[PDB]
Amino acid sequence: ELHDVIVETRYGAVRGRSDGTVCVWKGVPFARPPVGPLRFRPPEPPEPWSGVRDATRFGPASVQPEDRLISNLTGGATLPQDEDCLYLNIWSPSPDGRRPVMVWIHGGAYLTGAGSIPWYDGTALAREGDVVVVTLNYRLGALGFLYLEDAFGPEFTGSGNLGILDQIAALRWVRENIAAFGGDPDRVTIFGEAAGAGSVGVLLAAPAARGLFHRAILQSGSGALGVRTAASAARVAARVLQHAGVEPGDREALRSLPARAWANAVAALGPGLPLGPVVDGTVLPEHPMAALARGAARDVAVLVGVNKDEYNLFALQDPAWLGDDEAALRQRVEAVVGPAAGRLIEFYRSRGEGSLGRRLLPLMSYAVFVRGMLATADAQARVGAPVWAYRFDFETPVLGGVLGACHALEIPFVFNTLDRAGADRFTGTAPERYAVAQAMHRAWIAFAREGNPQHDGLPEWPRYDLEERAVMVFAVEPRVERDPWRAEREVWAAAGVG
Amino acid sequence: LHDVIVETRYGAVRGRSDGTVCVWKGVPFARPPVGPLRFRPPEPPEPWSGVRDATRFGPASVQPEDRLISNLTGGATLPQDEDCLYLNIWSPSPDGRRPVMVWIHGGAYLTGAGSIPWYDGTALAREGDVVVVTLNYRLGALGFLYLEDAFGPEFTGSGNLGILDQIAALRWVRENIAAFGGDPDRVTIFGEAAGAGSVGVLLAAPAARGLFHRAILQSGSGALGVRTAASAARVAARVLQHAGVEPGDREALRSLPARAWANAVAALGPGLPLGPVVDGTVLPEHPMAALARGAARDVAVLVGVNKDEYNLFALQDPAWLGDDEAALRQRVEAVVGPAAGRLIEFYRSRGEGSLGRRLLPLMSYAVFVRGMLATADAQARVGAPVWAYRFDFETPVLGGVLGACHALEIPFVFNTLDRAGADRFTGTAPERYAVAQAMHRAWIAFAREGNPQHDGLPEWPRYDLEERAVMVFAVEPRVERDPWRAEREVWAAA
Amino acid sequence: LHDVIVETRYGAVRGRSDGTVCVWKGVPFARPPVGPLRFRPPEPPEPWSGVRDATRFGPASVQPEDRLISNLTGGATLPQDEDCLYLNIWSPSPDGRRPVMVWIHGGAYLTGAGSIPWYDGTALAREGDVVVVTLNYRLGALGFLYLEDAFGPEFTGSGNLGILDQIAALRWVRENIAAFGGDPDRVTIFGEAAGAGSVGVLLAAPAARGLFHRAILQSGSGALGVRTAASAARVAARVLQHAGVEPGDREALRSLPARAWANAVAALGPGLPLGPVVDGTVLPEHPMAALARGAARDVAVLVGVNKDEYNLFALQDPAWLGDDEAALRQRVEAVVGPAAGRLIEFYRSRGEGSLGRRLLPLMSYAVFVRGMLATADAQARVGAPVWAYRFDFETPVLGGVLGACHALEIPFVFNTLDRAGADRFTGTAPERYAVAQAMHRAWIAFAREGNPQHDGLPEWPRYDLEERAVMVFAVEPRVERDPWRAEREVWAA
Amino acid sequence: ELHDVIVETRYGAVRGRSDGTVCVWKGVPFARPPVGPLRFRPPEPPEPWSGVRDATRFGPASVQPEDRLISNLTGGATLPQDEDCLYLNIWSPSPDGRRPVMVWIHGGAYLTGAGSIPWYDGTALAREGDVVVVTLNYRLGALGFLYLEDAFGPEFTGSGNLGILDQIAALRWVRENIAAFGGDPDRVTIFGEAAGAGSVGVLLAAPAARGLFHRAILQSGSGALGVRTAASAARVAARVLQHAGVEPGDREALRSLPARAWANAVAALGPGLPLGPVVDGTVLPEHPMAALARGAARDVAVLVGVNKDEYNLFALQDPAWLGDDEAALRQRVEAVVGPAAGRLIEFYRSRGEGSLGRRLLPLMSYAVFVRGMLATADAQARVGAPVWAYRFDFETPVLGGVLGACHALEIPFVFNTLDRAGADRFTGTAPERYAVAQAMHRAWIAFAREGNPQHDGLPEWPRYDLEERAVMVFAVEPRVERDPWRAEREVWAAA
Ligand SMILES: Nc1ccc(Cc2ccc(NC(=O)OCCCCO)cc2)cc1
């Protein structure tokens, strides 16, 4: 029942596949392959081709270190990978028409992820919403985010944010090329999770990105999340360069090094967030939250949210977050909040259950996730942009119930990909989950369509405002909660850090 | 007893009437799925000259001997054939446009038939002035074998062949029920267990749209048994290996004796191996996703469970009478997996007596209750009329170990308590007859007027998110609001 | 606290006594294997005149971070250098001739040090009047990279540089131990996990013979981590490609920073890539084949495992705690291959909890339990004295999922429960003191008397094929006969 | 009538009082007063005195916090305190004779208590048992158990165990001088309750205590109970020093600070047992359970036991133990047992009857009390030391019987001091208490004199061993029950 659909981009015709209800194009190039001279340089428009370019198979992902997250609790796979990775994938109802478009930037801490990830499959989104879904690749890790301005001078300006430049390039392709695949360029929605949600925050600042997207969705991330100063990023690059063996100012060595050595050279740094968005002063002139506050996205409508137990996912990576040892927990908190650690540890210890660490995870959830979201939601209300806010409370039962409503759990609900690549393992197989999944997926569609996420599956969902801070909670029973983090908002306001 | 002859679109059929009710039995709604037609979508029956007998039941679908209730009950093995696609009609008279009740029997998608005496429509027909139809759908591998991997796209819908027969039966009812005195614009489908599981699929199924206006789900839901295509594809290979049919061998697929499929499927073991599959054609999406979206907003639904669903299965596996900690824990994990430990902890503390007895509500909640409650709330949110029930009448038999077990409610709705072997299942208590009537008239009311309210019952509000009123079937009937409130939270949270 | 000066064959070294025990730290037993000495067999240090400080620990071998244990211990980054060939001596007095216990640490041949606090020999020395040596050996590529094909004949034996270092430390102990209060002819070698894996190699290795009279194997065997020459070359070729050293590029090989080798090992991926190699010289044949022939017929053995070793590795991979069969099948099949179907079926029926949790014994048996019993069988069959143990004390951490996890016995054996964050590893139960003492004292009695029996324990029979008696450590010590009889049947067939 | 009886200690003559059946000396110093310079120093033998010293009145208690848990229920007045607190009290039938000696080390969590408290009154034991009874004061709180070896350097080594050192000084005094008061120095039994029992357990680990006792009784406490590691005590000492306003290395601040200020600083740390015996590596070379496991007390014969509802006393402090609030109860349990909390609560909830807190109270009894008893008892049996186990099941009916057989209830029973001020309120007024007391009062007497607690008022009382795990139950009808804690020992060990 699968049939071909052939469409011509400005650069060339591509052959994709349709069953008559949805068309899918995979591995469509939105930029020139960023290799050789183009490596550590911004994306350029793709080179034109004669003939019909095959889009039946997914394009190779950016060279990345292995992430246990994909392998351990998802069957997942080791992603097929290549330095020539600048490809996008399209799901759309029909090439005739002008449907709203949803543009997905994946997370994974700026080190991992792909648009091709099975749970990001756009078949359900395209069918349900009468919308177009695009997933794209952006350069990751050292090849994507190494800040070489201090190390290698002006020729590497913007090197800190080349992945962001990749996301900008893909958005330009959407505005330039999406019509051929059945989309409307004036109703484009960008949505991302984790590092992708960070990327959306950065995109919201970037003057270069302006006018590529009316609406943005930031899931389990914010413009604060992972963003770096030029100096901090310059030091990281030197540590990275040293593992690579590349002396600063050595152009021959930087091109010569194998891409896999670049992935490993970052991997040697150790667990955490070694690379992120850089405030380089060109691509990112200022901190994204600073630009957010000044009103850069006042015209843009934004939907932003977090999961109830955000940091709990990382306990799988770092098992100390289960122990009761007080000294170590302080050390982890110190890195997050610095000198204010003493004040916050005292507050959170009283609340919650279990070991001190179990009670401390909400502190971590707030600092990394909730603080960014609340700042994001608050900033928009002042500037007058319509904004809606959510918390994902659906809890996976696997691994004892320690995870709860953890980081990355919410993705199958938005994409309606519960059945995709045996997701049930991560979230469980409870029948109620379809209802909440349908509630979130249709809300996102509703937001992408009319700038209002309301639909019939959900109770009346009010706009987020400074006064009442209404939050829609996705759970087995959805409800709207006003200022749910008020205690957390105020304590962080008084503890010097918020 | 006088003969009654009716005309279907395909031919005349001869039935029987006692002057109160007319019964037509083994009326064929589809062509025999044999030879080339085997493992293929249902086809219209071949026209016959003459008046075809509708006095005798057709053969049942080929089945293993389950004997779960039959060992307790007087019940005996049904005659079986692959040519089993027949429906049975009881009606007061062929004249008229009465409300129609279409019954989907349970048995876990693997056993049962419309010919089972418990599904006799005489009582429903006489009391409520409706036409009641009972039907056969294809069971097991011949009904539900997912062959798309083995033989490719050509056998699309193999996963849902039994549901397609139900649709064909529903299409037949629109064509022919007028001839027997039913109104095709008033068709209600009602089922128990796997029957109810099929009912939830029908609310999703696009091809079923407009073949019915109402649904009744007993001890089952569209959550029950439904599998993904990948999950269904793996099950087929195990059945084929026991069958000894190579994937891609069409001749061997046809050459194989029909009985071999029952053995091949049965050898795999207890569970819900086969059920409706979310293949994307018959079932485009999981049945539960359709309920939330409001696909069944048109349909008035009556959904419920028995008070002690899981006790029935103790007849094969007797641990549930015991206090033994180790055995009960392992059983819980098989059904609910990672939540078992904590779930066991919550249920142990409530109630009295043995651990198994305290644990059985957990298992009732996992298998049956969860689907029923999700159905009602999806309907409540979209505002479709929904009523909920719990059946609390318990059987005295077996020392009361069953209580209000799975499948006990069947004679109560059908007013067939005095049918053979029903009382062995239900006991012979005098109080049971009023209980059967109280459910029965609310069942009749739901088909006839869309509201199950009647004089025997207290006021029964529609199910809503806020109050979640549920009618409790008991010697003294009462509405209980949000009876599952405490249990709802713990499954969702930690 | 006073300085103590003690004279080794190579030089004077300055230790310290609290009045009860004397400790020497950071005593060099070989020339630092740097520069030209890098990737070469260990050589005795150049002698020095005068007094060197031996109050401070030597540098550890360069190693990847052990996040799994380091989170539980909390320890800062380990000071590390290619110049890492140091051992540490605990003695009641430099005067005397006591039996000697020489410790080889685990860490999968890439990580660890003698400087790790759990291995502190004071409690054994103070309680047992024994000399304890803890040592560092070259780790990772600098210890175990097979370079014979890649860089030619200068690197004969390069697979076993870390094993050669252990022998060199044992030679230095032989000549110099009398000076530290040891008897150079009463030496028991004991290790855990990869340390016991080296012990198994030592029992097999011809050159090791006579450097030790007794062996203790905890959670390890001569099978552990050992690669055929063929397997080692395959892993070795990968490392250079990661490293960016071309084969034959000798100067780049010597010039490359030691940290860069460790990064290259991490790039190969998770597992046990590096280990002792059957090069035909250091290891003429496989340790288990040599043990069966009688190569270690002289050596007396105490051999054992913990009850639930593999639970620890579930922290890295939660699939073992989860029910996801395909990953578990991929995980189980990779070590046992075709046999896993039945084994997975065999284990599935028995036990409690998740499929992976029920499957966890399968991995424990494949990696540890089988090698232990193979080692014990050979020593009994050849006529060597051998004793067998199982450690059943359970950690309460992480909801008690770890149970008697891998390495749990280490604080009990050394009686280092008081050391920082050991109680985090072991919990706060008082019973542990009594369990530690049972482990503590029988380890002492095996070194001193050659028999693990002591008055606190019930009758401990020698492991033999007839009864297969194994002493079971728990809150109440008991002997269980043929405890794995059921599991032995299934694995063979 | 009370008339003077005069005996001369090595340090001088003492004037005590005889009723013609029992002689008592109060306020006898076994060490020079640890005040000023002697503060934070090991006890020093008293300077000898010429003359007849007044021993008619009890000596001052160690400076200690107020007690309300039992003091409010019974009615105790505020204890007289002074930094000069090192005094002991002797009960003896006559200065003539060679009796066995029972020396009592009181509980109070190393912060409170005294030997002079009426419940420990030794009159009945001497009169009934022909034994010498000594009760003593040891420095408490900050002065007793602060570990200053790290904070203040070598001069304060062993400061963590001064209270333990105070007890040792008294035992030496007993060895040298007890024959003067009509006792035998080599037939000495030490006995202690709660923290007192901890002191007895700890003393078994300490080398100097060896030979100062021949037998030991540990009641509702253990060598694990309250004992802190060198780092942990250093943690508390650092917290104590900050609260005190004493800079590390400032001896002037250390000496100058008022004793109450030492008590006030400790209170500010918050609820629990901040101070306790320290494994300093001098006084305490090893953990007492390690010392038992090594066999250090293999020759010492021990009698050890617990009460049925030890932790119920704490219900008076915290009503949650009567309440059904799960979240609050779990946090108190979690603080103690950490990761192990969840499974044991399931086990404990599975057993028992009544409220959630009621089911969680035995959890705290076993963790804090029962497991410590068993570790001591189990260690003793292994080395071949004679050991005996008991359980006291008599329940107080006060405040609705919710306390049951609470912690410390046996104390008046052991001494047969039920009529002493404030004891009837704690035990109730049932007639059955005397019958249970007589068997309990006499069992301690018989063990001290003969090393065996057996006597006629009790049924045949088997030695506790690992094989049978026999435990004598004291009740209105006393009975032997075997392995009464069987379920807990397995569940606590196993999973
Ligand atoms: N991913 C992975 C899988 C299996 C193994 C097997 C293994 C691990 C360790 C040892 N021996 C050892 O090193 O003992 C200390 C435990 C590791 C702490 O660094 C043996 C086999 C290792 C890593």
PDB file of C-alpha atoms in Angstrom, chain C residues 179-301:
ATOM      1  CA  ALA C 179      64.170  -6.262  57.012  1.00  0.00           C
ATOM      2  CA  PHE C 180      60.516  -5.260  57.539  1.00  0.00           C
ATOM      3  CA  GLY C 181      59.820  -8.084  60.009  1.00  0.00           C
ATOM      4  CA  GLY C 182      58.625 -10.646  57.439  1.00  0.00           C
ATOM      5  CA  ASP C 183      59.768 -14.162  56.738  1.00  0.00           C
ATOM      6  CA  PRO C 184      60.824 -14.192  53.036  1.00  0.00           C
ATOM      7  CA  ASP C 185      59.853 -17.884  52.926  1.00  0.00           C
ATOM      8  CA  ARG C 186      56.338 -17.658  54.441  1.00  0.00           C
ATOM      9  CA  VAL C 187      54.447 -15.786  51.684  1.00  0.00           C
ATOM     10  CA  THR C 188      50.686 -15.959  50.996  1.00  0.00           C
ATOM     11  CA  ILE C 189      49.382 -14.138  47.894  1.00  0.00           C
ATOM     12  CA  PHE C 190      45.759 -13.020  48.013  1.00  0.00           C
ATOM     13  CA  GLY C 191      43.633 -10.836  45.733  1.00  0.00           C
ATOM     14  CA  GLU C 192      40.037  -9.951  44.907  1.00  0.00           C
ATOM     15  CA  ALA C 193      38.396 -10.046  41.480  1.00  0.00           C
ATOM     16  CA  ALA C 194      41.015  -8.982  38.903  1.00  0.00           C
ATOM     17  CA  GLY C 195      43.563  -9.331  41.771  1.00  0.00           C
ATOM     18  CA  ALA C 196      42.446 -12.951  42.241  1.00  0.00           C
ATOM     19  CA  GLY C 197      42.497 -13.230  38.445  1.00  0.00           C
ATOM     20  CA  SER C 198      46.186 -12.361  38.614  1.00  0.00           C
ATOM     21  CA  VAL C 199      46.511 -14.860  41.489  1.00  0.00           C
ATOM     22  CA  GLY C 200      45.129 -17.554  39.178  1.00  0.00           C
ATOM     23  CA  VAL C 201      47.711 -16.516  36.580  1.00  0.00           C
ATOM     24  CA  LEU C 202      50.400 -16.610  39.259  1.00  0.00           C
ATOM     25  CA  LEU C 203      49.542 -20.213  40.161  1.00  0.00           C
ATOM     26  CA  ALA C 204      49.893 -21.078  36.469  1.00  0.00           C
ATOM     27  CA  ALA C 205      52.913 -18.933  35.599  1.00  0.00           C
ATOM     28  CA  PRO C 206      56.298 -20.812  35.743  1.00  0.00           C
ATOM     29  CA  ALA C 207      58.309 -17.711  36.749  1.00  0.00           C
ATOM     30  CA  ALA C 208      56.027 -17.061  39.763  1.00  0.00           C
ATOM     31  CA  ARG C 209      56.858 -20.455  41.300  1.00  0.00           C
ATOM     32  CA  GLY C 210      58.415 -20.261  44.756  1.00  0.00           C
ATOM     33  CA  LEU C 211      57.628 -16.526  45.156  1.00  0.00           C
ATOM     34  CA  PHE C 212      54.595 -17.603  47.258  1.00  0.00           C
ATOM     35  CA  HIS C 213      53.634 -20.714  49.300  1.00  0.00           C
ATOM     36  CA  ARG C 214      49.861 -20.048  49.705  1.00  0.00           C
ATOM     37  CA  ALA C 215      47.007 -18.453  47.705  1.00  0.00           C
ATOM     38  CA  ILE C 216      43.633 -16.813  48.566  1.00  0.00           C
ATOM     39  CA  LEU C 217      41.187 -16.175  45.696  1.00  0.00           C
ATOM     40  CA  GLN C 218      38.200 -13.882  46.356  1.00  0.00           C
ATOM     41  CA  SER C 219      35.706 -13.385  43.523  1.00  0.00           C
ATOM     42  CA  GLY C 220      38.312 -14.299  40.927  1.00  0.00           C
ATOM     43  CA  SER C 221      40.055 -17.009  38.957  1.00  0.00           C
ATOM     44  CA  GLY C 222      42.802 -17.507  36.429  1.00  0.00           C
ATOM     45  CA  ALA C 223      40.066 -17.272  33.718  1.00  0.00           C
ATOM     46  CA  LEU C 224      39.106 -13.720  34.684  1.00  0.00           C
ATOM     47  CA  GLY C 225      39.835 -11.169  31.957  1.00  0.00           C
ATOM     48  CA  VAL C 226      42.370 -13.430  30.214  1.00  0.00           C
ATOM     49  CA  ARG C 227      42.622 -13.135  26.419  1.00  0.00           C
ATOM     50  CA  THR C 228      44.073 -15.431  23.811  1.00  0.00           C
ATOM     51  CA  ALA C 229      46.975 -13.976  21.857  1.00  0.00           C
ATOM     52  CA  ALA C 230      44.541 -13.723  18.916  1.00  0.00           C
ATOM     53  CA  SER C 231      41.907 -11.827  20.957  1.00  0.00           C
ATOM     54  CA  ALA C 232      44.549  -9.498  22.450  1.00  0.00           C
ATOM     55  CA  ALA C 233      45.873  -8.442  19.036  1.00  0.00           C
ATOM     56  CA  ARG C 234      42.366  -7.562  17.856  1.00  0.00           C
ATOM     57  CA  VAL C 235      41.752  -5.310  20.888  1.00  0.00           C
ATOM     58  CA  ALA C 236      45.306  -3.946  20.588  1.00  0.00           C
ATOM     59  CA  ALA C 237      44.886  -2.843  16.948  1.00  0.00           C
ATOM     60  CA  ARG C 238      41.776  -0.841  18.003  1.00  0.00           C
ATOM     61  CA  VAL C 239      43.618   1.007  20.746  1.00  0.00           C
ATOM     62  CA  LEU C 240      46.323   2.414  18.486  1.00  0.00           C
ATOM     63  CA  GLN C 241      43.748   3.593  15.976  1.00  0.00           C
ATOM     64  CA  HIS C 242      41.898   5.389  18.813  1.00  0.00           C
ATOM     65  CA  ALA C 243      45.245   6.625  20.140  1.00  0.00           C
ATOM     66  CA  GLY C 244      46.431   7.938  16.792  1.00  0.00           C
ATOM     67  CA  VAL C 245      49.738   6.019  16.968  1.00  0.00           C
ATOM     68  CA  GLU C 246      50.668   4.364  13.707  1.00  0.00           C
ATOM     69  CA  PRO C 247      52.062   0.795  14.026  1.00  0.00           C
ATOM     70  CA  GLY C 248      55.853   0.942  13.859  1.00  0.00           C
ATOM     71  CA  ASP C 249      55.913   4.564  15.041  1.00  0.00           C
ATOM     72  CA  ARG C 250      58.152   3.907  18.000  1.00  0.00           C
ATOM     73  CA  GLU C 251      58.803   7.472  19.013  1.00  0.00           C
ATOM     74  CA  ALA C 252      55.087   8.311  19.042  1.00  0.00           C
ATOM     75  CA  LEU C 253      54.553   5.143  21.117  1.00  0.00           C
ATOM     76  CA  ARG C 254      57.081   6.275  23.746  1.00  0.00           C
ATOM     77  CA  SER C 255      56.238   9.983  23.394  1.00  0.00           C
ATOM     78  CA  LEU C 256      52.446   9.603  23.689  1.00  0.00           C
ATOM     79  CA  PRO C 257      51.146  10.896  27.073  1.00  0.00           C
ATOM     80  CA  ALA C 258      50.080   8.182  29.534  1.00  0.00           C
ATOM     81  CA  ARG C 259      46.683   9.844  29.985  1.00  0.00           C
ATOM     82  CA  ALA C 260      46.126   9.486  26.197  1.00  0.00           C
ATOM     83  CA  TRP C 261      46.457   5.679  26.525  1.00  0.00           C
ATOM     84  CA  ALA C 262      43.750   5.622  29.225  1.00  0.00           C
ATOM     85  CA  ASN C 263      41.410   7.722  27.022  1.00  0.00           C
ATOM     86  CA  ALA C 264      41.921   5.227  24.192  1.00  0.00           C
ATOM     87  CA  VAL C 265      40.847   2.309  26.405  1.00  0.00           C
ATOM     88  CA  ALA C 266      37.606   4.065  27.360  1.00  0.00           C
ATOM     89  CA  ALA C 267      36.968   4.581  23.596  1.00  0.00           C
ATOM     90  CA  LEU C 268      37.053   0.801  22.945  1.00  0.00           C
ATOM     91  CA  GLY C 269      33.830   0.552  24.895  1.00  0.00           C
ATOM     92  CA  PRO C 270      32.513  -1.062  28.077  1.00  0.00           C
ATOM     93  CA  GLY C 271      33.832  -4.421  29.203  1.00  0.00           C
ATOM     94  CA  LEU C 272      37.075  -6.232  30.052  1.00  0.00           C
ATOM     95  CA  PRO C 273      39.143  -5.459  26.908  1.00  0.00           C
ATOM     96  CA  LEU C 274      42.508  -5.782  28.620  1.00  0.00           C
ATOM     97  CA  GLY C 275      43.785  -8.624  30.718  1.00  0.00           C
ATOM     98  CA  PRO C 276      46.573 -11.215  30.989  1.00  0.00           C
ATOM     99  CA  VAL C 277      47.398 -12.709  27.596  1.00  0.00           C
ATOM    100  CA  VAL C 278      48.421 -16.227  26.746  1.00  0.00           C
ATOM    101  CA  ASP C 279      51.459 -15.032  24.826  1.00  0.00           C
ATOM    102  CA  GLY C 280      53.154 -18.454  25.206  1.00  0.00           C
ATOM    103  CA  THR C 281      55.992 -17.036  27.387  1.00  0.00           C
ATOM    104  CA  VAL C 282      54.662 -15.404  30.566  1.00  0.00           C
ATOM    105  CA  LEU C 283      51.619 -17.657  30.200  1.00  0.00           C
ATOM    106  CA  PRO C 284      52.680 -20.794  28.265  1.00  0.00           C
ATOM    107  CA  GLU C 285      49.110 -22.190  28.425  1.00  0.00           C
ATOM    108  CA  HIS C 286      45.797 -21.161  29.986  1.00  0.00           C
ATOM    109  CA  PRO C 287      45.870 -21.047  33.832  1.00  0.00           C
ATOM    110  CA  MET C 288      42.986 -23.514  34.168  1.00  0.00           C
ATOM    111  CA  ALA C 289      44.665 -25.962  31.778  1.00  0.00           C
ATOM    112  CA  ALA C 290      47.923 -25.534  33.705  1.00  0.00           C
ATOM    113  CA  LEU C 291      46.115 -25.995  37.053  1.00  0.00           C
ATOM    114  CA  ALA C 292      44.499 -29.242  35.810  1.00  0.00           C
ATOM    115  CA  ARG C 293      47.911 -30.580  34.714  1.00  0.00           C
ATOM    116  CA  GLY C 294      49.385 -29.971  38.203  1.00  0.00           C
ATOM    117  CA  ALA C 295      51.320 -26.705  37.583  1.00  0.00           C
ATOM    118  CA  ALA C 296      50.221 -25.338  40.962  1.00  0.00           C
ATOM    119  CA  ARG C 297      50.252 -28.714  42.772  1.00  0.00           C
ATOM    120  CA  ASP C 298      52.394 -27.165  45.507  1.00  0.00           C
ATOM    121  CA  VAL C 299      50.231 -24.174  46.260  1.00  0.00           C
ATOM    122  CA  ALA C 300      47.532 -24.274  48.946  1.00  0.00           C
ATOM    123  CA  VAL C 301      44.354 -22.403  48.057  1.00  0.00           C
TER     124      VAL C 301
END
